[PDB]
Each structure stands twice: as C-alpha cells, then as structure tokens.
Symmetry: D2
Subunit: 385 residues, 4 copies
C-alpha cells in the first residue's frame, strides 16, 4: 500500500508521516509544494526522507497557483462574506490535484492530508480528490487518531525522535491567515506584531506611493509598465502593498461544516488587484452586465470557500465570469498610504466613458423615459384608490 501525503515539514505533518506508517504499514510518498510560503521546500523534502518517507517530491507551483487558480477566481470578483479574499480556499484544490496525480503515477491507492475534522480544508482536499479520481481512498489522520491533546502529540514525536519547538497560520503567494489561540475571542484584537506579510501601518511610509496595474483580458499583465508573469506580478504587488501595510481583514466567518470561526487575513497584492480590477471594469463593462455579474459573485465565492473548485457549478459560473472578464482591458492607478488603497484614476482602450454625455439623447427624451417608468407606480397609487 502506498500513501501520498501532503507534507509541509512542520511538526504535525511529520507526526502524521510516522502515524501513517505504523497505522497502515504502507510506504508514504511525501509531497511538498512551493506556492509562496517563503520556505525552502527541499528542506521539507529532505526532512520527509528522514522522517521515513519512501519518496519525497518538491515542486515549484507558484506560477500554476496564480495562473490557473488565483486569476480565474479573481475575474469573478470573488469575496466571501464581505471581506475574505479566499487565500486558503483556492490553494487546496491545486494541492489535491497534485496528490492525486502523484498517487496515479506512483500506483498509490491513497492520499493523506493534515487538515483537522473541524475545518473547511478537509472538505476542500477531499471534494477535489474524489472529483478528480473517484476511486481514490482518502486518509485524514486528524479524524482517525487517539491523541487527546498537544502534550500526547509532543510525546509521540519524541518517542519517534521528531524535531520539536498562540495561533496557527496558513501562507501562500496570495495571503497569510491567522486563526486559533488568542484569536478565538471575537472581542479580542489581534496581538501586536502578529502580521508577517504586511508591515504595520503605523510604521508605513509617510509618503503615499502610486502604483499602476494593467489588465489585458481580465488578468493583470504588468505593474508600473513592467510586464510580469502571474506569480511574478502577485509577488511584486505583495512587496509594494506589504510595505504600506495594505490588505488586513479581521472577520468571524461561517465554516461549511456548520460553525463560526474568527479569522484574520492579510492579502496585500490581492487587495490591490481587487480594486485595480474594478477600476478598469468601471470603464470597460456595461452597466447591466456588471450588475448581473455582481449578484453572482457571492455564490461563486461560497463555491470556492466550501471546496467546490472542480465542481460543475463553479466551472459553469466560470464560463460566465470569463466571458465578461474578457473585456477588462485597461490600466488602474492606485494610491497606497498607511494600510489603505485608494483608486485615483483608470483608463481603457475601449472605455465606454465620454465626458460629453455628461458635459445621443436630449432633455425631452429624459421626460418620456420618466413617464413610461412612472406609469406602473401611478396606476398603483390610483388603484390603492
């Protein structure tokens, strides 16, 4: 039996690697992916080989992540419950896709992940695993084992000789999320110095910095004139935005599994891309199209949050969002200043804006429009007798 584990190199997935061997007595192929966590994956790959893995793969997936996941999602204008930019949600699908491809190639019947039983990640990993390979077996150590608390786990580690050391966190090119620990009290403010991706607004530059993002077809292709690849472009905007402390969100979200959770997120580049995109859409999209797209954004957002990336519903909606996003061509000019992003200007080759209509229709026309529109309201008032 072979098991492909999403190995991160940390304490838990390390414990998990030992646990899969003793419990299933199978070969555990460890898989670590670089998606922008700011970590040397080869260090995790080597530690994997030492922790017992029979094989350990480490792939650079920054470009695929941004190109095939972050961007398609951004074109939809996806935002979960008002502020969540789905940093962790779009990542999981990519990883599960690789676990299944690897198992397929290694002749492994199962894949494993270290997501707990109380979160969305288990569902995200699994829903995409079963969607891509229906007969794949999935092992979720957190839902199967007996450890009743941290203490027991440290001991099991030492017992197996495994390296050992507030809140937990997830990071990638799109963001860093912080949850648990002192964060569980929704009336409690995130502790000083918790953030890592963005600088503290209070320590941000005293002079605003302007940035321009060009969109060609629904996707950002250049920053301040320099053409950048998807992963390269997101990286650049993280640097520029992070320096100004942009993209901080503090929310109590609704998990798919039934309960509420207090989360804190920092998405510098993503927050700039969010506003830059809408700025360009303000000139390139027709009113009615925009109004319809916006009413569907929320649904697409929960589809991603819940883990339905490789679900026919999302791919259906994606056909709609992509059709609309195709017209988003132009440039956005934003002003970054102490934790904030301000749209200050935008332009587009095929802008629908013309200061002459506000500088083919005249006064009288507006009158008839009003009459026709008011008819049903007048008949109503009259009938209300």
């Amino acid at each position: 039996m072979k098991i492909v584990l999403a190995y991160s190199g940390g304490l838990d997935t390390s414990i998990i690697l030992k646990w899969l061997k003793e419990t299933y007595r199978a070969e555990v192929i460890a898989f670590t992916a670089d998606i922008g966590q700011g970590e040397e994956v080869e260090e995790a790959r080597e530690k994997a080989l030492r922790t017992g893995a029979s094989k350990a793969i480490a792939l650079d997936l920054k470009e695929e992540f941004v190109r095939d996941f972050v961007f398609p999602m951004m074109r939809a204008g996806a935002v979960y419950e008002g502020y969540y930019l789905l940093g962790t949600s779009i990542a999981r699908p990519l990883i599960a896709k690789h676990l299944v491809r690897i198992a397929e190639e290694e002749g492994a019947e199962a894949i494993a992940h270290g997501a707990t039983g109380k979160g969305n990640d288990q569902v995200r990993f699994e829903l995409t695993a079963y969607a891509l390979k229906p007969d794949i077996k999935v092992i979720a150590p957190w839902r199967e084992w007996s450890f009743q608390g941290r203490k027991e786990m440290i001991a099991y580690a030492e017992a197996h000789g495994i390296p050992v050391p507030p809140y937990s966190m997830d990071a990638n090119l799109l963001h860093i999320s912080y949850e648990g620990g002192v964060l569980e009290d929704p009336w409690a403010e995130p502790p000083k110095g918790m953030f890592r991706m963005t600088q503290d607004p209070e320590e941000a530059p005293d002079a605003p910095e302007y940035v321009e993002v060009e969109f060609f077809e629904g996707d950002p292709v250049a920053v301040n004139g320099e053409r950048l690849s998807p992963a390269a472009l997101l990286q650049r905007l993280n640097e520029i935005g992070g320096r100004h402390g942009v993209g901080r969100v503090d929310i109590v979200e609704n998990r798919f599994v039934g309960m509420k959770s207090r989360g804190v997120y920092e998405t510098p580049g993503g927050t700039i891309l969010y506003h830059a995109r809408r700025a360009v859409e303000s000139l390139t999209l027709d009113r009615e199209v925009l109004h319809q797209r916006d009413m569907l954004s929320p649904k697409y957002a929960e589809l991603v949050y819940y883990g339905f990336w490789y679900a026919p519903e999302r791919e259906a909606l994606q056909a709609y969002f992509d059709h609309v996003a195709r017209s988003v061509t132009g440039v956005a000019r934003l002003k970054l200043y102490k934790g904030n992003v301000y749209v200050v200007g935008r332009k587009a080759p095929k802008s629908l804006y013309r200061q002459d209509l506000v500088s083919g229709y005249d006064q009288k026309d507006a009158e008839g429009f009003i009459k026709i529109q008011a008819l049903r309201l007048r008949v109503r008032a009259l009938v209300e007798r």
Copy 2:
C-alpha cells in the same frame, strides 16, 4: 397657479424661482429642508422671499432623513457597484415627499425641482412625486428653459438682480458628493483640498482611535456607550470618522439616464456604520441567511440608485431585509486610523459563536460522512466521463 419649489438658496434654484414667475406667472412656494447640508436653511428661506417667493418654508428634517430613509437602507447592506453608499439617492425621496405634501396643503397644482436633464435626480424626484400623487404636475426648468451655458444663466441672473458668484457638490448628514469639472477625467486624481467632511489621511491623528457602536435591532443606537438619536448618531460618527479621513470613494459609476459618470464621495459616519453592522452580523446572523441577503443587496442598491424608493419592489425587499435585521443586536469595536476603518472586535447578547466548537456537540467523524455525501455527484460525474 401655485408651484412648490425645492429651493436651496443657491444660484440655480434662485434663477429657477425667477423663471417660474416670469414663465408661468405662478405664485411660487419655496421649500428648503435641512437634511444636514451645513447651510442655514433659514437664510435660504429669507432669500426666497427676497427672490420673489410668495411663501417660504424651512424644515429641519435631519431625524426623519436618518430614521426613515438612511437606516432602512443600511439594514439592507446597500452598496451600489461595490463602493457607492447612496448618499444622494436616499435623500431625494424625502424631498419629493414633502414637495408633494406641501403642494396638497397649499392647493398647488404643481411642484418643481432643480435637477438637470442629464442626471438621475430628475428621475428620483419625479418617480417619488408620481408614486405619491399620480395626479401631480411636475415642472423641470432645466428641461423646459432655453438657457445654454453658465454665461447666459448668469446674465439672466444679473438681469433680475439675483446675487452672482471647479466641481459640483451635494451634501447631507450621510455624505458629500463631488462631480464634474476637473473631476470629469477618469485618469485625473481629485484636487488636493476638495474634501470638506473628512480630514485628509496625511493629516489625520498619529494615534489610532477606537470607537464602539451598539446595534439594537438592525439600527445603530449608541456610540461609545452613549445613546443617541439617529441623526445625532450619524453626526457623531461623521465627526469621529471624519477627523481620521474615513470613507472616501472615487469611482466611475453607471447612470440610469446618462452613460458613465465619475464621482467622488465622502461618507465618514456611514462607512463606520457599514463595517460595524457587518461585524455585529457576523455573530448574530445565520450563514445561509447572510449569504442570501448579500445576494439581494445589489438589487436593492440599484433600486435606491434609480429612484424607486416608494416602489413596490423596494418595499417588498425591505420586508426581507427588516426581517433579517431584527436579529442584528450587539456591539462592534473599530480602530480608526489614517483614512481606514478596521474591525478589531465584536460581541452580541445572542451571539451564534461558540469557541467550544472550534477549539481543541461536534464529532470529527461526522465530517467524513458529510464529505462523502457531498462528493457523490462529483464522483458519479467523473465515472460517467469514465
């Protein structure tokens, strides 16, 4: 005949007042409402008599504005095209309402407004008027007169003796709108020194400031522990959020009548109220209710933006939103800092949040069955594709 005019004391409405006399030879009843423009509505009232009005009425409508218009709209989480909080939109209905009411009391055949022929305000003024009094006659001078240019208008104003003088403005307790002039070029940043309700970020305090807002039933009822009337509460939050430069929006919006239009708005209090409400909703509203409400907000928003406030569709959605808002009870804690509004805390007497369910009534193995059932249709799909 009698004509009730929405008179503001400004140059254009003064010109209109004279025009209504000269053209219709009508007795003109001027109406000025203080909805928080920061003007001395009484001065406007006296000016109207000075300009020819046969009667001048000045009312303080701050409270009615925030309690019967602003609040109901906020409950719905209304946001036009992602950023506009509808400061100008919700005010129009209120004014048309009183114009129509004053016209009936005064036995006046018609009412008149000063909205141009290229905007949405005319639609907003008239849809409300026709909805409340189907038999009402409406006169829109901007659409009826022959003037062409500010040159001609000023001449005509100079002629009749009406006192004479970069962008156009509109203000009330909720916000201040800026558009036209140097603002017409979408690629041009707004000019330094334009904002009047909000301090500029670069000049905001160096220390962050915390503020708390209590919601009892969908409506904000207090700030930092002090109970305040709707109008006084918005006022208080404009001051607090204003000194920090909170609530500035710069967008190109889609009009109902014209094409696109570049607008700049400052809504200090409203912006604080928008994030506070959602913070209290994050504890008091059910997941599926919240997701559904958010999918209807955009529609409610365009209804308000287009002028359909006293229209059956908006009253129907209002029933849905009022039903959901009744649960929003609690307190939000925000950190204001240099143009930004950060939610740092929230609490509610009937909070649906349970740390016990997240920390390390919930059985981990239940999730596996949940997952397998959810995954079924997806596995069948793959299998059929083979």
Copy 3:
C-alpha cells in the same frame, strides 16, 4: 427509556416498533397522524398497542398541515426542478414537529422514524427534529440494524407475530407519490392503473368543467363561491381536479443525499391552486415584484425539498413571499379537461389591469438604447 415513533401501521414501522423495544429495552410511544392518507388512523393506533406500544396516539392534523405548511409554501409559488410540487417535503416537518412535542410531554429522550438510510426523508425528519429540540436523540433503525434483506425482515416479523401481507408510495392531502419497481427505469412509462388519486385522462369526462377559486390575502378561501376551511378546500379541489386526471408529474429528480431518482406524482388540487394563484397575481401583483418573486421561488422550493423548513433562511424568504402574497386577492376561473387545467378568466377588486403618449415612448426608447449605441460606436 422512552422513544416516540412515527408509526404508520405498516409492516416496517411495526417491525421497527418491536426492534426498538428489544434493541433499546425501551417503552415505545407510537404516533400516527392523519394528514390525508386515506387510512383509518385509529386502526394503526390500535395495531400499535397490539404490536407492543406502551401507548399510541392518533391525531387528525389535516387542517394544521394545509394551513401551516401547504399554504405558506404555496404563497411562495414553489416548484422543485420545474415540476415537483413538494407533497412529501412539506409533510415531514409537521410529523417531526409532533414527534418532538409528544416526546417532551411523555418525558421521552428519543424519537424514531422509518425513513431509509439512502433517502431524503431521514434528512427532513431529523433536520426539523434537531432544529426544534437540539437535545433530542434520534433513532433511525434503517441506519442501525443488520437485516440483510427482505426475506430476513419478513421472518423477523413472523417470529414476532406481525402480520405479513409493485412500488413504494406516500400520500397526504396534497399528493400521492410513487417510486421504485417498474418506475426505476426512466425510459419506462408508468404502468396503467398505478394512479390512485386521479382519474386516467383517457377516462376523464367528455365535457370540460369550470371551477372558480377565490383568494383573499395569498390563501384560497373558497371554491365555486363556497367558503371552505384550508383542509376542506384542498379536499374539494382534489375531487374536482382528480376526476379529470389533473396534476400528474413524471420526473427524474435530484436528491439531497443520493443521486437521481425517478418519481411519479399526482397533485390534482395543488395543481389547480398553482395556476389559480398565478392567474390572480396576473392582475394584482406589480411587474417588478412578480419578477423578483419568481426568481426567488426556486431557492425556496429547494429549501423545502431538502428539509430546511424550520431553518432561518426559509423563514426569511417567507417574510418576503408573505409580504407579496398579501396583495393576492381575487377570483381565478379555470377549465378542466382530460388531464389539463386551463385558466379561462380572472378578476380582482384591486386589479392593475386597465398615462403616456407616443412621444413619451420614443424618449423611453432613446434612453434605453443609449448604452447600446455607445457600445456599438466604441467597437468602432
């Protein structure tokens, strides 16, 4: 330990009653409700006592069903996947509601139902059970016992003294449902003679029959001029509609739990009410209100179908639907003929049926066409 059980008197719920006593060494309180199944609920009640029930309750819930579940759902104009009028779905919340109530009165810690492990009813039963009483324990024998098959269940029944007698069914005042057996092949037409609540359209009367339905506030209050209580009114329209073979549906539906299921439904009375309601709305509802309402109905139908009746989302939408329904006041006139229902007339006290001139229309057109022209010009 006590357990309240949804008892129908059938073979399975009878076997279940025995199973519960033995498996949980519990005192079983049987509950049978008359919601229009066309059975003598008192015989099920007596049979439960014979089978071992420590108590048996039988209630006539036909009025509560129609007025508190069927009617509110109809105000929403709810239709699941284009055709299903939700007969089974709106009934379960009511049963589970009473199971929990009776359990509270009897000091029982658990309730039980006979829904299978792969169906949707188990969800409907339990979703409302947990929503009304979060501390309740639910026992679903189909998911907990070992029975390897029919033959085995039958032998179990015989051994216990339960009397042992081609498709599953479910009936109530709203409809009768059929599935399984020959019906499991979506390419096979339902067998001749399967239908019970409605006459075969090929055997329907040679002359069409007219019917009038009055609505006062979203709810039908009379038929052909005679005021009738909610249950009485549904009964009457089932008679009139049934005799003509009206209300037959044959669909392949998407289940909440399983995959796809093939079902046949007959809802004579509710089908008439469906078209009668929309006929009245056509004169009383505002165009924009109607369009928004119809865009929300599907979501509501889905909530009902899944079993989210006592869920906050359905209740939120209900406030909207009810608000709209308040204006539905008037009379719909229909013509029934061999399986079909035809709206033939409608009138209302506050009808919006029968301002501007031709020049007004041109301006309307110009303003509406503006963004289109700009787009065309911009495509240069």
Copy 4:
C-alpha cells in the same frame, strides 16, 4: 433619401409606404420576410412595387429564425411570467437585423416599421436597430403621423389606389398570439374557434401519440429518429402537437411599455420542445448546475421580452446557458393527448442516473453537520 421598410403587404404598411415617400421625399425599399406566418411573401413583395417601392426584397428566414434565435433562447429554458414562450419577442431582433443590413447595402440612412406608438413591439425593433447600427435613423410612422382615425386612413388608402379589406394576431414558426377585442376582458374566455395553429382538445384524436425528440448539444436534432434541420424540426412538432391541441396559454402579462395586456398563445412545437429539453436535462445536468440555471432563466426571459436580444447582458447569460446546454444530449419520450404533453420517458448516453458511494453511517454524519447551525440557533434562543 432611402428608407428600408419592414413591409408585410397589409393595409397599414402599404399606407406607410405611401406616407413615407411623400413625408420624407424619399424612396422606399420594402422588406418582407417569411419566418413562418404562412403567407406568400413573394406577393407582398410585388404589391410593394405596385404600391410604389423603388425596390422590394423578400427572403426566406425560417432556418435563421429557428437556428439563431429560437434555439439559442430555448437552451436557456426561457419562460416569461410562468407561461409565455416568447414567440413574438424572439422574432423582432431578426427582422430589425435585416432592415439594418439592407439599409447598409442600399445606402439607406433610415429604416421604418409599422409597430404602434403605444406598444412593446416598437421597442423591440428599435433597440436591436440602434444596437447594430448606432447611427441609423428610425422612423416610426405611428408615433409621427397625424391620422386621427381608422376611417381617415381608409380614405387615404383609397385615395392612393391601395386595396382595402374581433382580435388581432401575429404568427411565425414558433407560435400565433391573439389579443384585443373580445380578448380584452380578462374574465371572458376566448371565443370558440379562435385558434388556428392547434386543433381544439375536444376535437383531438382519441388515441394518444408518442413522440421522441433527440437532443445533441442543447439543440433538438431529430424527431422520431428522423434528422431534421432547425426549421424543419419545429414545423414537424407543430404538426404533431397541433393535431392534439397542445400548447395553449391564456395570460395577462406585464408589458415593458404600458401596464398589462391579456394575451392568448398557441405554441405546439415549442411546448413539446420545452418539456423534452427538461426531460433530457433531468439525466444529463448536475443538480447544482440545474438549480443555478433555473434561477437565471427568468432574468433571461425578461431580457428577451423587453427586446434586449443584442444587448451585452443577454449575450453574457447566453455564455452561461450555452455552457450548460452543451451537456444536454439524449432522447425524450413524450405522450400527447388532448391538449396535454406528458413526459413518459428519457434516456441519455451520459446519464448521471444509476437505479443503484456511501453507507447509512455516511448519511448520519451528513445530517449532523447540516444540522449543527440549526442546533446552535436553538440553544441560543435558549
């Protein structure tokens, strides 16, 4: 000056042809199109020349009408206010499209139509015209002329040598609508023998007829095993369903311009296609996809109804509907009997149906999770 006129050969469009020449001092290019009205279009074309057109054009647009308008719309499951299958609405964009095409080729600066100045049809003609040629000049005689009565119009027609002749109708391959006259009383049942496209159910065959419709990719491609082109297939189903009196609707609909109007429609072929399509989707479409689609259908329906066919919104939705419809491959079996259509069977190569992935225990976990938020709500309400 040249004016392309949507000419039908009737009294009013003939009168309009004369009115246009004199009022605008221009020549008129008459355009008549056959979209299934059952009239000989070539005769209207010759009458146009006789009436004064400098050029009369007559085209057979049946296939384009069904292939590019009817079909695209049906894939969206479009139904206006519960029953209207939009027979009049999807036909206008097609006609206006050709008026603007002929205008560009003939060097005409303007086009004209005979829609009334108080109805919805005018909006349909003009919205697509302006959307396709923003600079086109549109002349609507009914909104512009000074005729004050029917009588005066007859005298004008007689004066100009134009031959002169309880409800008004409109027909094409999809349906035939009826309105006005005795039909204006919403409480009055339509007059006997009014229907033309469908036999009265009382006179329909005593024997039910089974029909099988094959869908390949969201569009019907065969009836009872016989492959048929789009127009040929709609014609076939009109004959079959019509013989049984299928597809009659009687509704008071909400207008885009004006209030409400009582209309009666007969759409035999389209009604069969409607159920046949859903029958195949019941086996080919994913649950969540189907639910989403149905929630967008109403919106699409009003776009088509109001006349926003060549509008970006409609085309954006069409991208969604076409994506979904592509999976609709299979065959639907329907039973037709005295005015009704009954789905009695459906099959598909990629059916997602297996009379047959989880066990009982799975079902319980599912319930638990789904019920959590509800239980929490109850505990909180204490």
